[PDB]
């Protein structure tokens, strides 16, 4: 889409309908008159179009209404009501934009943000743009959270976010126009290479992959058609569905052979019956032939009784010679029909260990996208976020993804090396207790109105807790943390001094020897400008490889390469890096997934902020004081960076409305 309806899509919004959020802000309009709704939708899309048309600088309400066209530019109050709803929930004027109306002399309200993460940074700029006092507590000595950028010499690699999943309707596209970003497309071509180091053949590559997707649709059918989501009372994992789909195909291969060789024995036994008549008929022919020869011995002239006995036996012997030929016509058809069934046998087996190996590489590919083994992924809801996928190529940041958070964090209040130990949220305010990571005696006390908490789901999931919430987070919230999934994904980086790979291929596979190693270094990537290779460890493999030294990993890593490129070709790498995210105390994993028994609806529970109890008993229900943002909190875009970013714009809206007034809902 292009035009005004393009801007509505680039902003993740139906051009021809009001969203459920527009309804709570504009309920006099949504429930009003069908023409009314149309006028408003045009004002919305038209504004989005202006900001997206050149988002380097702020969109004043004056500039909007300037450019608004009659009859739309008549109701100035509606335009304000709309330019506010946008700027407020950060559908416009988010990011790094030169500000027209300079920041207010004196800010109102104090907000501590736990974590200089991408979600956290996103909130910081909006609240600071809104006119508030924002201060960020980060446990690391570097700004980005899971956006990590290793940099040495000219070597550059991201051990965190690496690819932008499509600019169609993506907030990150706007940042690139604002930020300096070398976005280069990834070419989807991916070869495969088995344990031998010999490339896979187009025959099998395609035979396997299509059967993979077909197996996916099979599970999807089980999930929504046969309501297969319980068994011995537990929830059904995606992996469990897969093996019941595979086990019903290995069942059908066997049923299909059995009712084929059971056809042969039906025709073997029609022949065994047939010969038995032929042999018995021959004996009757052999004896009538005798009798004929014996009564031909009586010489002419003979009386008529013996003349009949030669005529008779001759007609009887011609009668059984005529049967025996119609039973050698019939042995003709069956002896033929039985080379038929032997020359057209069915499929020998469902899958060759060569097939199931290349199939286990398509399951490593899933376990990469979800950063978990498929035993854990929920059968019905693992892909629940498929509908909001963006459009276009996937891209990479060749100058390092960390350039974004560093750009995002310019001019904010950030306290590095500040480990939050305890969040106290009370009816009158919040006090955040933080140690200095270097000297963990050294204590920090921070007081504020509301606390925005971009702690990664792992850190929350940690037992014993890295952070203690005073008071306890309530049971609906804690149970939403057990049910969800935080999974694990790791990267090995290999920095050589010259390219020894196909440079115009951005990525290639590696098929693993058993199932249990299916994610062990299953995929490589060539994206950085310098000669750098980068290799994934998905599935059960990635968690288990945290306990092995770099050298052992890199050794293994180096081997697979030699088998694909030859021992002479691969030199020892100059510098090497191994991530261990389940091991990092400021992650406790990689990103999140919809665990079996969880839903996309536990992602919504993570956003719902907490309003503390009355301090004085009998006092009026207070404000909600504790806010949550992060990739784990945003149902429609989880596990990503764009998604985490959006969530921190979400809470910048929700916070400002709660503490600076809903001035657009009149």
């Amino acid at each position: 889409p292009s035009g005004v309806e393009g801007a509505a899509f680039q902003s993740r919004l139906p051009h021809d309908r009001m969203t459920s959020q527009e309804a709570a802000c504009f309920p006099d309009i949504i429930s009003g008159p069908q023409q009314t709704q149309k006028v408003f939708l045009f004002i919305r899309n038209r504004t989005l179009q202006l900001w997206l048309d050149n988002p380097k600088i702020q969109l004043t309400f004056e500039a909007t209404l300037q450019q608004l066209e009659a009859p739309y530019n008549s109701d100035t109050v509606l335009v304000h009501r709309v330019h506010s709803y946008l700027e407020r929930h950060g559908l416009i004027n988010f990011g790094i934009y030169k500000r027209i109306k300079p920041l207010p002399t004196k800010k109102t309200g104090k907000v501590i943000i736990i974590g200089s993460g991408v979600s956290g940074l996103a909130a910081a700029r909006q609240l600071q743009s809104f006119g508030m006092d924002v201060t960020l507590l980060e446990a690391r000595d570097r700004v980005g959270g899971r956006v990590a950028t290793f940099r040495k010499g000219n070597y550059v690699a991201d051990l965190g976010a690496m690819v932008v999943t499509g600019l169609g309707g993506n907030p990150m596209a706007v940042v690139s126009k604002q930020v300096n970003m070398e976005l280069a497309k990834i070419k989807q071509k991916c070869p495969l290479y088995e344990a031998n180091g010999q490339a896979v053949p187009k025959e099998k590559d395609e035979m396997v992959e299509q059967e993979f997707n077909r197996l996916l649709e099979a599970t999807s059918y089980l999930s929504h058609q046969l309501d297969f989501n319980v068994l011995n009372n537990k929830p059904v994992s995606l992996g469990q569905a897969l093996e019941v789909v595979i086990q019903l195909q290995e069942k059908h291969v066997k049923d299909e052979q059995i009712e084929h060789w059971k056809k042969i024995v039906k025709t073997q036994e029609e022949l065994k019956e047939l010969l038995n008549k032929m042999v018995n008929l021959k004996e009757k022919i052999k004896e009538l032939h005798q009798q004929y020869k014996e009564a031909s011995e009586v010489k002419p002239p003979r009386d008529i009784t013996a003349e009949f006995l030669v005529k008779s036996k001759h007609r009887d012997l011609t009668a059984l010679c005529k049967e025996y030929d119609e039973l050698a016509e019939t042995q003709g058809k069956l002896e033929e029909k039985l080379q038929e069934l032997e020359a057209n046998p069915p499929s020998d087996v469902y899958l060759s260990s060569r097939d199931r190996q290349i199939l286990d590489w398509h399951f490593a590919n899933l376990e990469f996208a979800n950063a978990t083994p498929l035993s854990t992924l929920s059968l019905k809801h693992w892909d629940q976020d498929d509908d909001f996928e963006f459009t276009g190529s996937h891209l990479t940041v060749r100058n390092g993804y960390s350039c974004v958070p560093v750009a995002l964090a310019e001019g904010l209040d950030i306290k590095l090396n500040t480990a939050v130990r305890q969040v106290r949220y009370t009816a009158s305010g919040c006090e955040v207790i933080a140690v200095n990571t270097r000297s963990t005696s050294q204590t920090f006390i921070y007081k504020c109105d509301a606390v925005l908490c971009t702690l990664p789901l792992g850190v929350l999931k940690q037992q014993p807790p890295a952070v203690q919430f005073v008071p306890p987070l309530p049971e609906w919230k804690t149970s939403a943390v057990q049910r969800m999934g935080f999974g694990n994904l790791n990267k090995v980086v290999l920095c050589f001094d010259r390219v020894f790979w196909d440079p115009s291929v951005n990525l290639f596979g590696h098929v693993g020897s058993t199932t249990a190693s299916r994610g062990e270094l299953f995929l490589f990537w060539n994206l950085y400008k310098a000669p750098i290779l980068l290799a994934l460890v998905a599935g059960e493999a990635a968690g288990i490889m945290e306990n092995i030294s770099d050298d052992v990993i890199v050794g293994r890593c180096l081997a697979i390469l030699k088998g694909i490129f030859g021992s002479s070709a691969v030199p020892q790498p100059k510098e090497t890096v191994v991530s261990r995210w389940r091991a990092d105390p400021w992650a406790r994993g990689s990103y999140s997934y919809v665990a079996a028994g969880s839903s996309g609806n536990d992602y919504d529970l993570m956003a719902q902020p907490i309003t503390p109890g009355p301090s004085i008993p009998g006092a009026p229900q207070p404000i909600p004081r504790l806010f949550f943002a992060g990739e784990h909190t945003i149902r429609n875009y989880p596990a990503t960076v764009h998604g985490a970013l959006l969530s921190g714009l979400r809470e910048a809206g929700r916070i400002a409305d709660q503490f600076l007034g809903a001035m657009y809902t009149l």
Partner: peptide
Amino acid sequence: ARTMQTARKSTGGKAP
């Protein structure tokens, strides 16, 4: 999740 796959994106269970 499924959106993340950049190479050999899976098809089954999508809305194509």
